[PDB]
Design a protein around this ligand. Structure first.
Ligand SMILES: COc1cc(C(=O)N2CCC(N3CCN(C)CC3)CC2)ccc1Nc1ncc2c(n1)N(C1CCC1)c1ccccc1C(=O)N2C
Length: 125
């Protein structure tokens, strides 16, 4: 099987805007995660062909990655911050679903998730 197309990062039918919370998600949250030592597996869509994972997209039907989130934020694709937060959570949950508790990649995802929640909490009122 080929890889599926990546998640859309623009959509001419979907209203878009820029908000302070969305700017924070790009300039602080995504920036912080992107530079983390464990970011690399999450910086692009899972290439199931290259990784020899013929069953990845049989199991994961809602793929998401930080490369896609980054482009979405840069493109002002979202209407609200909870949409973007959901994309991060989808990415983490996918990792937990495909893999098993305690796996190397699961620990990496858990570390990133902890940091993500810290940065979200730090959003100034
Ligand atoms: C760019 O994408 C990758 C590069 C390489 C790689 O060959 N690399 C890593 C970078 C480079 N490093 C050199 C040393 N420096 C310090 C860091 C970079 C050495 C060369 C390997 C895998 C990559 N992609 C990837 N993307 C998502 C994954 C994943 N892999 N894994 C792997 C289990 C652990 C990761 C999985 C394996 C099986 C089933 C599921 C997953 C999974 O859930 N996720 C999230």
């Amino acid at each position: 099987s080929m890889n599926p197309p990546p998640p859309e990062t623009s959509n001419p039918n979907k209203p878009k805007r820029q908000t302070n919370q969305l700017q924070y998600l790009l300039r602080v949250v995504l920036k912080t995660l992107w530079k983390h030592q464990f970011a690399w597996p999450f910086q692009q869509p899972v290439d199931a062909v290259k990784l020899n994972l013929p069953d990845y997209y049989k199991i994961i039907k809602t793929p998401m990655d930080m490369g896609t989130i980054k482009k979405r934020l840069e493109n002002n694709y979202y209407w609200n911050a909870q949409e973007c937060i959901q994309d991060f959570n989808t990415m983490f949950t996918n990792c937990y679903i495909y893999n098993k508790p305690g796996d190397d990649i699961v620990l990496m995802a858990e570390a990133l998730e902890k940091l993500f929640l810290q940065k979200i909490n730090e959003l100034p009122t």
